[model samples]
Target: EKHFKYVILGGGVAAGYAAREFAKQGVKPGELAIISKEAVAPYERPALSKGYLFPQNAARLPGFHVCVGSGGERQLPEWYSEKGIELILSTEIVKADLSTKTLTSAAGATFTYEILIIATGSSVIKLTDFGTQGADSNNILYLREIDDADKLVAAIQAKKGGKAVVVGGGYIGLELSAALKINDFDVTMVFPEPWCMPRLFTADIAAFYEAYYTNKGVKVLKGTLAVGFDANANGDVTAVKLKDGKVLEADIVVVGVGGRPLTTLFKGQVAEEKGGIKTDAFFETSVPGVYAIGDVATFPLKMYNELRRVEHVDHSRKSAEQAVKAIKGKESGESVPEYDYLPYFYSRSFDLGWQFYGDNVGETILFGDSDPTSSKPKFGSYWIKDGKVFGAFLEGGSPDENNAIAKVAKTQPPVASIEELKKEGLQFASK
Candidate 1:
């Protein structure tokens, strides 16, 4: 068994960012190791849905890598060796014993650590995993990793000009539908929601994008579920059966329903809340010397005065850094302030993109030019609670414009009048 002063379990965005912070915080070489189930060093996971499927010069590894995500220099594989950080890849941990501070891999490898950072992230929730009929058919895919992206690319190449059925109205489905359309596939997007992005977008906001997708020649089937998939003798999906009793022919099926946090490894060994491993402001888990960051952590939200588990990249990066900062501060007997986070999330598809900040609650206020048919279309929604702008979502915003909205959400500036706010539109944020 090998031991490290610091060990990061599960390599992803958080693991990479944490490694960079540890090095900056003065960690000796060989004192840190990152164990990942993934075969490659951490690259940008967000690239999987966006740039990976690009038709020309798709993003490849070491290019969309992490650390650079926060405007820092790219940390390549060699960077790890140079930093004396060992990367243990392609290993599957069969058991984790937090009590003994040891992890046993299925490959019979064992590791012990003085301090541990759990960055297991999340796993895609498969329809088949929930017993959805015909989910076992071939050519049915879900994207979560580099290998998943590779399979999607291969499917597109193999089925050029073919049909694609995308099940799920979330960001993954929206992005994949656009990727398929760009690859010359006839694509149909089906979801049980009345509109897209039901969790975030207002009815008006969803209407604009739904119309935009329709104009792009992608079939949008709302208020529906993919009840089953029909496969041929080769076990490849030939068509998708809908709950509304309609059949959509498809060469491939991509499901992006959602994901579950990878917290099963820590089950009873740590405190749990909100379906994630419970952590404090410093990302310190219930177990001493053990921290949880990324998707697996449901930590305190200093801003909202609550506990939240955010699955977005911004928090993932911040939480990891905060955890490392707290650990180092403890050694110096210095106090690191509790994490104050402004909720942020974003997505892109085709030529359109969107960003959201803060809590999406309270009085719904729709404003700006949300018309998809317009030449210069830009719009946003503000969630006003107790006369304060608690949350905002924007599409087609400049960098400054985006910052303004974020500022408004953070400040929770008073809205003298909804009439004034709507008439002013994006200008409200600027003011």
Candidate 2:
């Protein structure tokens, strides 16, 4: 049996960040071991849908950008080795005995630890209704891992100017569609929602992107759900069948339905609500000596006084930093630091670069002309809740205004009324 002071399961961003912190705190060699199921070192997953999907220059997809060649600027391996952290890749923890603080691996190796960190991350949610016609099959593809992006890229290159159908209009689907369109493929986006990013943006803001893509010659089909698939005589996907009984011809189909936390391994051991692992403020699970972080962990947000799970890269990084502090006993308080920063995410779609910040759910105070297509430098939209600022979304706004709105989210101060805002030079852009 091998023993270590700390054992980290999963080798993703959260685990990598925490390991770096531990090393900075003077954690020595043989004190930490990172057991990862993947054979390769940890790398950023978001780029798989963007830069990796369409390579620029000699930069290859996914891990290559973070691991090898001149483009391998991230250099996670050097960081891990410099920190005196041992990485056991391609190893799976088959079972964890919390009572004995022992972990048994699939290879029949045992490791005991004083502290254990579970950063298992998340897996892409496959639309099971698609059955064998799912992305895992050759006819369709799902964008999540490096290999998945590679497959799609190869398919596009081989069938240049071919017809493609993209399911879902969220960030990943839209981004991939844009990339394919840029690559000269006839691309069509099928979304069940009335507008793109319905969960993230209001209909007004989302409509802008819809028009933006449509004007770029990309077919944006809204209010459509893919009910089935049509295969050619060779059993390859030839078209996608919609719920409305329309068949859209396609050479390939890509699905991006979102992801669920990968916490199935801890079933019956830790407390879970929905599909996420429930953690306390300090990121401690119901099982002592075990901690969960990243997308799988859900905890309270003191700033918003809401309990939620954040699945963005920035949130995962911040959460891992807090978890490390909690593990080292450096955080002296029982209350976890409130991680209620304004929700921020960015995506590039068919040459229209955009970033969305803040929740768009509450009472909104709009600024600028109501026409989304109006030629304007920038527009502002504020979400007010109970006489306080809850969220704000900006479109083409000045940097100074964005910074100010972000400050407002942190302060949660009372804002001026619509009339007052107009008097102060802010215009209403929505009813």
lDDT winner among the candidates? 1
Runs off by more than 4 Å, candidate 1: none
RMSD in Å for model 1: 0.9
lDDT of 2 by residue, 262-347 (tens): 88768888888657888877788898768888888887766766666777766666677777777776434445454444566556
- The superposed Cα distance between candidate 2 and the true structure at residue 420, in angstroms, equals 2.8
Residue pairs in collision within model 1: none
lDDT of 2 at 18: 70
Which TM-score value belongs to model 1?
A: 0.98
* lDDT assessment of candidate 1: 0.91
Worst 10 residues of 2 by lDDT: 64-73
Q: Estimate each model's TM-score.
A: 0.98, 0.87
